[PDB]
Design a protein around this ligand. Sequence first.
Ligand code: HEM
Length: 110
Amino acid sequence: MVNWAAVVDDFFQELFKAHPEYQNKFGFKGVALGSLKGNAAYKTLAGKVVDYINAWIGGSADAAGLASRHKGRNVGSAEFHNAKACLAKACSAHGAPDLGHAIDDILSHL
Ligand code: HEM
């Protein structure tokens, strides 16, 4: 398998390194990056992102719904363009397929 859990962990390391302020929107606001994996709010959230990736791969991803929910948190195109870059790094680091098309689908609804 691809270890998508590991890809997602590196995604968040990249994301919050480049944009620490994005972490303020989550239940793990203020938690040291190096300790995120031990945080309960983070574990649940990371699991859902993994689920979304597996839903995209499996053909059931709802990009319109995901976009709508993110707009509902005042998260928009600029943030998802930054996420796209961080996710490409995380995928590359693990020899995982690029997920750019999945992010482009979300971006099309933003
Ligand atoms: C690769 C890009 C991203 C993916 C695949 C993704 C996916 C998800 C998923 C699956 C959830 C779980 C709830 C739901 O399904 O709506 C979620 C929640 C959330 N996302 Fe993202 N997201 C991405 C980028 C971002 C970015 C850049 C931000 C910027 C702050 C963000 C902010 C949030 C917030 C605030 C929540 C809710 C957290 C909570 O309920 O406590 N997302 N996201």
